[PDB]
Symmetry: D2
Subunit: 268 residues, 4 copies
Amino acid sequence: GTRYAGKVVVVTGGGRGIGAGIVRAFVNSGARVVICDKDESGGRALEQELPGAVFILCDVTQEDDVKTLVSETIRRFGRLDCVVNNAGHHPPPQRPEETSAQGFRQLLELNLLGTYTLTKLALPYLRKSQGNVINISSLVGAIGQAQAVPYVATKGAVTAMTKALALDESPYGVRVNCISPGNIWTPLWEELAALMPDPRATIREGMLAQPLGRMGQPAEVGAAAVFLASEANFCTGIELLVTGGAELGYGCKASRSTPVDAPDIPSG
Amino acid sequence: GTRYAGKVVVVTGGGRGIGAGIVRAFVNSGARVVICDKDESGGRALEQELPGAVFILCDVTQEDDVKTLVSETIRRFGRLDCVVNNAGHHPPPQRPEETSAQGFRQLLELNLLGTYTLTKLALPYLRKSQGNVINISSLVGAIGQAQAVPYVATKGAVTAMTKALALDESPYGVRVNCISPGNIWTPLWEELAALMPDPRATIREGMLAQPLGRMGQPAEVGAAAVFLASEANFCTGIELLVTGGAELGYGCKASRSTPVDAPDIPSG
Amino acid sequence: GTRYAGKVVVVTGGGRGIGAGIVRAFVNSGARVVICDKDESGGRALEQELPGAVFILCDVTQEDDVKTLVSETIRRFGRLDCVVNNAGHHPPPQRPEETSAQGFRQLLELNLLGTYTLTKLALPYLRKSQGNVINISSLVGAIGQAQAVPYVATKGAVTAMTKALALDESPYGVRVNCISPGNIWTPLWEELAALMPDPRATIREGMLAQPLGRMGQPAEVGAAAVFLASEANFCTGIELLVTGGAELGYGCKASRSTPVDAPDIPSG
Amino acid sequence: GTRYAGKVVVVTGGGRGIGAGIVRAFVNSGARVVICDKDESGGRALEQELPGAVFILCDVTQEDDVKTLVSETIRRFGRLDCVVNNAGHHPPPQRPEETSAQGFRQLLELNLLGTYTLTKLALPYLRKSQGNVINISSLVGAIGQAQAVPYVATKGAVTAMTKALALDESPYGVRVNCISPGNIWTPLWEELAALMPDPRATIREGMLAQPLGRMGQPAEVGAAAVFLASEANFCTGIELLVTGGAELGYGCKASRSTPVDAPDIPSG
Ligand SMILES: NC(=O)c1ccc[n+]([C@@H]2O[C@H](COP(=O)([O-])OP(=O)(O)OC[C@H]3O[C@@H](n4cnc5c(N)ncnc54)[C@H](O)[C@@H]3O)[C@@H](O)[C@H]2O)c1
Ligand SMILES: NC(=O)c1ccc[n+]([C@@H]2O[C@H](COP(=O)([O-])OP(=O)(O)OC[C@H]3O[C@@H](n4cnc5c(N)ncnc54)[C@H](O)[C@@H]3O)[C@@H](O)[C@H]2O)c1
Ligand SMILES: NC(=O)c1ccc[n+]([C@@H]2O[C@H](COP(=O)([O-])OP(=O)(O)OC[C@H]3O[C@@H](n4cnc5c(N)ncnc54)[C@H](O)[C@@H]3O)[C@@H](O)[C@H]2O)c1
Ligand SMILES: NC(=O)c1ccc[n+]([C@@H]2O[C@H](COP(=O)([O-])OP(=O)(O)OC[C@H]3O[C@@H](n4cnc5c(N)ncnc54)[C@H](O)[C@@H]3O)[C@@H](O)[C@H]2O)c1
Ligand SMILES: O=C(O)c1ccccc1O
Ligand SMILES: O=C(O)c1ccccc1O
Ligand SMILES: O=C(O)c1ccccc1O
Ligand SMILES: O=C(O)c1ccccc1O
């Protein structure tokens, strides 16, 4: 592959799940990939497996880690063409009264402000390279999700901030886009399902949520990212849905504790 | 009620279902309402029950009926303030290979071109009154629907044409908006459910499609219409969703004939 | 007016601008309105002018102020039917490198977490009343805005969180919706324009941004809010646009420092 | 290139403009491309220039031409993997009173029913190949356009029908997606600009409509199409925007004949 040959790419949270999918997709396209992750285990494993992937330990909520990540990427590689803000977390299901403003704040540090800080520090270099930014939002930013008020809020923020940055940076030719994956089968998905009374039933409901009848794969988000960076030169501020059609058509939305009348009083 | 007192309102398909809901809502607001319907039974009944509602027999696919409707409304009432394009039909479920281009054309005559013809003839009078147009689209125009390719297409057209008209008519101060109802309990809904092997199970799936756990009522669309005409003077080209939240969150979207793997191969 | 008679309504930032528009609209509908504002001047003025409007000093970023606001509203009035989260701020234009993570955080405290905290504390009472929540987001949450990365992000968060809450609260019958105003002529708009080299030229560009050719008024957002609370019982999780059509059609989007070729090389 | 090697692709309107962009992009990916066009000049030229591109004369509004196109593609190539419905026309600017129902109908035959007829006949073969459909809609389907009520309506229909087909065809694994290009520099764009009093000023306004400051190219839509067909296996029913950001941020929307007050009465 040569669609992104020699470009320098930073992927946050690139050590597993969707981030690793994106890392492999960019390596496959010929890029130099800086894996940024707070966990050294998965990243150093990719670094050793994929030459041209390199691991730099970095928590994106720690402003110094991000300055050092950026500082090292330029020092080590002389340029920066693409930033894929992927580091993010989804808490276990929580009703609104089970969330705290403190938890919300911590989650904004990761999902939103981490994405913002790396982008701020990266923009002077992306301007020189006429690079682009890719943020990994989520479909629930667009249509909501049950028991995930903080998470949904951070993803609504990422998608909107992507459009704001696209306007601020178009005078420099720097594109700024986001991918909104639906249900992607990842360790995070697996870890969350394992907290449920019936994990496999929960995973099954995850697959049935798509007209296509399955969850997506990290590789498929990785292809979407490589397309945005390498072949979508007239795309900026877009929200690319990788969702298997989950947002389409009617479905079972009234919840298992939601009072529903019998079908003889259909409209109350 | 006085929020729309003495304004002259035309409601197509106003003889039953959502159209009658809208007719009652405008009468309640003090308007003069011209009920336009191809069926005389339901309309003349409203005309007799509601003074200030008046029935004019008119098939909106028949250009002469629409010229005569418009011609009679001005002759009889001297002005035209509001056109609610509601006349529309939803065919029984049909797979794509069960539709014909002829059926599609007939359905466009009603759902789209009927709305277009009345609007064209009404605009010279709406310009003088600084009136507005309200089109009744559907949520499936926005998110699709199974087994309804022609219907969905006509509703995608209505929603888009609403925005085109809003731009063409804003120099005159004529607002042009649409309501996109989700599942509304109406005779049409009832007639379609009755074609199913299990009508009440189908109606129940209709109610479960909403987080609110019920279908909407015609009166609730009627309130939305009266709000658009009488109190939304800074609204034009909007799509007002009356859907009970159907478009929100994940749901059961993989269809009963869609191959789905077991939850041990979640992503294929 | 009687469309919301005797319901108890809290409006944050109700002391001027859009908040005061909403306060007057609910008072006009017959509600008991608790004006919540951090500035006593504008609120106490409304409290004295409008009986049935009452002012309670409260900064929504101060968790104790919000507990006390909620505690006093129930103690004083015995119920809570409607929360209009309107308190919000738009900073002066700032390029991305002119924003700080600290400023972003402060802005999230107001625009997002203030809305979240009042909603959390209000929900137990809204559940009993089968009330509803109305958040005042912004159109730029949906389509972005130049030189406003933090602000846009907080409004993307508000709009998404509205959908998350609508799902979490539909089992209780509590609707949760937002209004996304476009350009509304308010003191905040005036204050921001006054920071510009040519205020009136800037205000003029604000009016030209709408096909309707003007900015909106607070009263028009107030009507939209009263409609959501009092007549949109089948609406939840919707984004109601009060924008004068700003999001429609093509416009002048390439910025005054954006390199644009001459029209003989149209596509680069 | 090998991303779509040996797949059989039909591109309607493939003889020039965006269609030819898509044809070259698929040929470049290794596909067998059947150029379908009503004009033989541009298509036979591509057929001779690009081996593996083949031209079949076909007007998509003529049901027999489409049956013969489909019949010949299978007979000649034994399979059908991808249908790119691109044939479409944009009439010169027309106010609503300058359109006729007849013109509207003719435009629906091309833009909508042509897309529908080829898809119907192609689906039995796409099911066997687990192929996909790509419709070329337009951004104005989503946000409207001035003086283009019929055109906008047909494109609203194409985008919605894409979602309906995606639901109907997901049980077979057949993806169905659309691209919504903004302003793309093509012969059609050039022909329309040439009808204006100042063509180059009009082209310049076309470029300024994008934050990126230029129009798109056919090659860029071609890349988007090849991505949808060859690498977006978890995408169905999506609307991929190729618009240079035109839908983002505020712009000059109040039209040159739209009454606008001076900036001392900003909100009427
Ligand atoms: N899995 C899904 O279905 C899904 C859906 C929509 C969006 N997303 C988004 O995709 C991204 C990845 O999701 P996933 O399922 O692959 O997650 P994951 O948990 O499987 O992997 C996330 C990676 O990010 C790293 N990370 C976490 N916090 C970090 C921090 N502070 N600094 C640096 N690295 C950090 C983790 O160590 C891990 O390697 C997230 O932003 C998530 O919100 C996922
Ligand atoms: N019912 C729903 O759930 C639902 C959902 C979304 C949109 N809608 C739309 O709302 C509108 C009304 O739906 P409904 O369920 O109330 O339907 P309905 O069948 O119950 O009533 C429709 C009315 O329109 C009249 N009509 C039909 N064809 C006409 C024609 N050619 N000329 C004049 N009048 C004509 C009928 O005679 C009838 O009185 C339609 O446009 C429909 O697409 C309905
Ligand atoms: N003006 C516009 O064009 C526009 C457009 C879109 C959205 N909005 C939103 O509408 C809301 C009001 O905007 P506006 O133009 O009327 O603003 P404004 O400045 O004119 O009034 C805002 C009010 O909120 C109060 N407030 C501010 N911070 C507060 C806090 N921490 N606690 C309590 N009260 C607080 C202020 O004292 C003031 O009374 C904001 O949320 C804003 O983002 C405004
Ligand atoms: N140019 C733009 O800015 C733009 C923007 C949005 C969408 N689009 C869409 O993209 C498509 C192509 O646009 P373009 O600008 O490249 O147009 P174009 O006029 O430059 O080329 C269109 C091609 O389609 C062919 N065609 C027309 N009618 C046909 C018919 N009945 N049967 C078969 N072939 C037919 C023409 O002969 C021509 O080769 C259209 O569907 C258009 O609506 C274009
Ligand atoms: O849809 C999501 O955003 C999501 C993210 C991580 C894990 C499970 C999920 O459903
Ligand atoms: O959702 C619709 O458009 C609809 C319309 C009429 C009848 C049943 C329906 O689901
Ligand atoms: O569009 C906005 O969100 C806005 C809000 C406050 C002031 C000016 C504005 O344009
Ligand atoms: O935006 C469009 O759909 C379009 C299509 C063809 C020509 C010019 C255009 O603006």
